[PDB]
């Protein structure tokens, strides 16, 4: 009679949380983070005339 | 084997959530064309402008009133605006009709001003509406910006300040837009009474002024969150590995024989003392007389 | 400095517990059968 | 020979659906629900002049 | 009145089925070994 | 049985990501009303072309 | 202009004029903006954001 040997199970995921949050065409927070600093990027909002 | 108590910690994936207030004025400019038998709005230019922190801390948090004259900066020029194109006043801040729990807002004007004129001419009006809203702010790692319930991204860390090395956080703004008031006593616009003193940051964004009570980064954000406290675990000593068997959860975790130094992980100051308190409570309530610590 | 990334399932750990339990019990019983034989 | 005892397995989740929908900076539906009643909140859209 | 919240995994219930099956079968076989012995 | 080598393939749920460039001009038209002691912007028509 | 998201523009200023007290004056800006963006398309790949 032979004994069962030890096994170790690995945490296998088919898709990660990032992959599951990468299936849409646009991300609202990404667009808003990039576009709400348009005036900071392309203008000088601290100089007064 | 080795019996003991364990606290399991998972990674914190949620955003850091706090509360702030937004102070801004709604500046609408309506242009009507009075015609033969009708009036036609030919333009309506709405704009949100900030309330400067001098005005806040000297009129709103002093008397609960807001000036009827907007003074701001557009196109690098110091522009103004007057409600109904009249002499400026200080109007009282009145609660919205929808002031349910949490999301509250106090404004001064329910009306929007416009004029038509004699048939054949254009006439221009102007509104100004002081609006103070309690919003829910929200920041995610690495906490160098926060978004508001109004939809606005504030390109400054929620922990930017002037003391405690906080001035070394991230900020996409000039240091002239940022104000900190140590010991500031906010005013509750409903009970008309000052709140308790607390350091308060103010930032004048081109379209609004954000104000939030300052709190240090070390005590508010944390990379790890408690998943499960386990009262009875068993640590085994398999070849090259530890094993943590938890018969109440029916879960077996497999570590290495080495300890993990939580100093390699960002923002891990919570775990040590939180787990110490939880484990001490569990021990004192369950294993006070049966076992002893090791 | 780094950050810890946690999976979204502890099904593997329940599998580990169940296999460990069945394996330990069956091994004890097999050992007993062998000694008695 | 001893028998295996009964076990009951608990539905363990590491993160709930709410926790998994709480990782972003802004929620489009939340912003839209809060901001599309600005005119209802701060103006009287039923009175005529 | 309340609402029912359902988990996003029935892996625990498949684990329960598998453990129940293995446990019942192994217990029947152990009982038989004991009676014959 | 049959020994061998295998490669497991899952469905690709991610979006196809590339890089592009956008070329546009920001055309702002500001109308001010110079008053007695102040200037008031009465219109500002921004447009991307 | 950090890594990846870069943008080149021509004007940091926005033009407006006030005039003599009692009149309207109209200005105009034009800002050439070239941005490197990240495009993104999902099946069946007949559009990209």
CA-to-CA distance for B255 and A28, rounded, in angstroms? 39
> Alpha-carbon distance E19 to B74, whole Å?
71
Going A18 to A23 to A27 to A30, the CA torsion angle's sign is positive
Q: Token pair of F7, please? A: 């490669």
Q: Quote the CA–CA distance of B213 and B180 in Å, as a whole number.
A: 9
The DSSP call for residue D28 is H
Answer whether B76 sits within 8 Å of G18, measured CB to CB. no
Q: Do F34 and G45 touch (CB under 8 A)?
A: no
Please tell me the distance from the alpha carbon of residue E21 to that of residue E33, in angstroms, as a whole number: 18
| Resolution expressed in Å | 2.8
Q: Is A18 on the interface with C (CB under 8 A)?
A: no
Is the sign of the CA dihedral D16, D17, D18, D20 positive or negative?
positive
C-alpha distances in Å from residue B127, one per residue of B29, B90, C25, C27:
7, 15, 80, 84
Give the span between the Cα atoms of B170 and B156, in whole angstroms.
6
Q: How far apart are CA B263 and CA B269, in angstroms?
A: 8
CA distances from C29 to A3, A5, B247 (A): 10, 14, 21
- Numbers of helices and strands, H then E, in chain F: 0, 2
**Cα separation, B111 vs B28, whole angstroms:** 11
In sequence order, the 6+-apart residues with CB closer than 8 A to the CB of F27 are F46, F47, F48, F49, G28, G29, G30
Beta bridge partners of B226: B9
Q: B50 CB contacts (<8 Å, ≥6 apart)?
A: B23, B24, B25, B72, B204, B205, B206, B207, B208, B209
Domain that holds residue D40: 1-49
Measured CA to CA, the distance from residue B60 to residue B93 in angstroms comes to 8
Task: State how far the Cα of D41 lies from the Cα of D34, in Å rounded to an integer.
Answer: 10
Strand bridging mode B69-74 / B146-147: unpaired
Against chain G, the chains showing at least 3 CB pairs within 8 Å are A, B, F
Q: What three-state secondary structure class fits G1?
A: coil
- For residue G14, whether the previous peptide bond is cis, meaning omega lies within 30 degrees of 0, is no
Is the distance from CB of B199 to CB of B181 less than 8 angstroms?
yes
Q: Name the residue in chain B with its Cα closest to that of F46.
A: B45
Query: What is the DSSP track for chain B?
Result: -EEEEEEEEEE--SPEEEEEEEEEEEEEEEEEEE-SS-EEEEEEEEEEEE--HHHIIIIIHHHSEEESEEEEEETTEEEEEEGGGS---EEEPEE-TT--SS--EEES-S-------STT-EEE--EEEEEEEEEEEEE-TT-S-EE-TTS-EE-B-TT--SSTTGGGS-BSS-TTSEEEETT---B-TTT--B-----EEEEEETTEEEEEE---GGGT--SEEEEEEEEEEEEE--TTEEEEEETTTTEEEEEESS---GGGBTT-HHHHHHHHHHHHHHHHHHSTTT----
Q: At a CB cut-off of 8 Å and minimum separation 6, what does B65 contact?
A: B59, B90, B91, B92, B93
Sign of the alpha-carbon torsion through B33, B39, B42, B47 = positive
Residue that is written with structure tokens 């009306």 in the block: B111
Measured between beta carbons, the chain E residues lying within 8 angstroms of C14 are 11-12, 15
Bridge partners, B208 (sequence order): B205
Torsion of CA B279, B284, B285, B288, to 10 degrees: 120
Which of these, G45, B59, B10, lies nearest to A25 by C-alpha position? G45
* Residue closest to D37 by CA, chosen among D25, D45, D47: D45
B108-127 as b/e: b if 16+ CB within 10 A: bbeebbbebeeeeeeebbbb
Technique employed here was cryo-EM
Query: Which residues, listed in sequence order, are joined to residue B40 by a DSSP beta bridge?
Result: B33
Which DSSP letter does residue A3 get?
A: P
How far, in Å, CA of F33 to CA of G24, rounded? 5
Question: What Rg value do the Cα atoms of chain A yield, rounded?
Answer: 25
The C-alpha atoms of residue B57 and residue B187 are separated, in whole angstroms, by 10
- Bridging pattern class, strands B251-256 and G24-26: unpaired
Q: Do C9 and D14 touch (CB under 8 A)?
A: yes
3-state DSSP assignment of residue A9: coil
Distance CA A41, CA F26 (A): 13
Q: Does an interface of 3+ CB pairs under 8 Å exist between D and F?
A: no
Interior angle at CA B242, CA B3 and CA A15, nearest 5:
120
The count of C-alpha atoms lying within 13 angstroms of the C-alpha of G5, restricted to the half-sphere facing its C-beta, is 10
- Residue reference for tokens 């929200």: B138
Say how many domains are in chain D: 1
Residues in CB range of A14: below 8 A, 6 or more apart: F10
G24: helix, strand or coil: strand
Beta-bridge mates of residue G24: F33
Can you say how many angstroms the Cα of residue E29 is from the centroid of all Cα atoms in its chain?
16
Three-state secondary structure call for residue G39: strand
Q: Is G42 within 8 Å of F16 (Cβ atoms)?
A: yes
Which of B172, B163, B147, B150 has the alpha carbon at shortest distance from B201? Answer: B163
Neighbours of D18 (CB within 10 A): 9
CA angle B222, B226, B228 (to 5 degrees): 170
Question: Cα–Cα distance between F39 and B53 in angstroms, integer?
Answer: 22
CA within 13 Å, CB half, D32: 4
> Which is it for the CA torsion B247, B252, B258, B260, positive or negative?
negative
Residue E21 near residue D6, CB atoms below 8 Å: no
DSSP-assigned letter for residue A5: P
Instruction: State which residue of chain A sits closest to C22, comparing Cα positions.
Output: A4
Nearest CA to C9 among D10, A13, D47, D8?
Answer: A13
DSSP 3-state of A41:
helix
As beta bridge partners, residue B262 has none
**To which H or E segment does residue A29 belong?**
helix A28-35
A14 contacts chain C (CB < 8 A): no
Chain F residue nearest residue B125, CA to CA: F42
- Best of B31, B76, B124, B126 to substitute, by most chain G Cβ atoms within 10 angstroms, is B76
Helix (H) or strand (E) holding A28: helix A28-35
- Chains with 3+ CB–CB pairs under 8 A to F are A, B, G
Q: To the nearest 10°, the Cα dihedral for B196, B201, B203, B207?
A: -30
Q: Within a 10 A sphere around the Cβ of E23, how many other Cβ atoms? A: 18
Query: Is the separation of the CB atoms in A9 and C18 below 8 Å?
Result: no
Token reading at B219: 């005590």
The CATH number of whichever domain residue A36 belongs to comes to: 6.10.250.3280
- CA distances for A26 relative to A8, A21, A39, angstroms: 40, 11, 22
């Amino acid at each position: 009679l032979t004994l069962l040997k030890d096994r170790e199970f690995m945490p296998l995921r088919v898709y990660t949380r990032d992959e599951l949050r990468d299936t849409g065409l646009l991300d609202y927070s990404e667009i808003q983070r990039r576009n709400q600093m348009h005036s900071l990027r392309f203008y000088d909002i601290d100089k007064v005339v | 084997f080795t019996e003991g108590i364990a606290v399991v910690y998972k990674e914190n994936i949620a955003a850091y959530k706090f509360k702030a207030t937004v102070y801004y004025k709604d500046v609408i400019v309506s242009t009507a064309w009075a015609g033969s038998s009708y009036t036609q709005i030919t333009n309506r230019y709405a704009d949100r402008v900030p309330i400067p922190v001098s005005e806040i801390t000297d009129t709103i948090d002093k008397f609960g009133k807001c000036s009827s004259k907007a003074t701001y900066v557009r196109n690098n020029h110091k522009v103004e605006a007057f409600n109904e194109d009249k002499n400026p006043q200080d109007m009282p801040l009145i609660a919205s009709k929808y002031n349910s729990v949490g999301s509250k807002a106090w404004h001064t004007t329910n009306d929007t001003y416009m004029v038509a004129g004699t048939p054949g001419t254009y006439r221009t009006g102007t509104s100004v509406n002081c609006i103070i809203e309690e919003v829910e702010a929200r920041s995610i790692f690495p906490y160098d910006s926060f978004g508001l319930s109004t939809g606005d991204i504030i390109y400054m860390s929620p922990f930017f300040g002037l003391r405690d090395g906080a001035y070394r956080e991230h900020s996409n703004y000039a240091m002239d837009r940022f104000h900190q008031f140590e010991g500031y006593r906010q005013r509750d616009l409903d009970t008309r009474a000052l709140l308790e003193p607390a350091a308060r940051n103010f930032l004048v964004t081109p379209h609004l002024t954000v104000g939030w009570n300052w709190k240090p980064k070390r005590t508010e954000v944390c990379s790890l969150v408690k998943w499960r406290e386990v009262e009875d675990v068993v640590r085994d000593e398999y070849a090259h590995n530890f094993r943590f068997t938890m018969k109440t959860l029916s879960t077996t975790f497999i570590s290495e024989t080495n300890e993990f130094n939580l100093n390699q992980i960002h923002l891990s100051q919570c775990v040590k003392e939180e787990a110490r308190a939880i484990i001490n409570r569990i021990y004192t309530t369950r294993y006070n007389s049966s076992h002893v610590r090791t | 400095n780094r950050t810890i990334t946690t999976t979204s399932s502890v099904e593997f750990a329940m599998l580990q517990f169940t296999y460990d339990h069945i394996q330990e019990h069956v091994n004890e019983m097999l050992a007993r059968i062998s000694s008695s034989w």
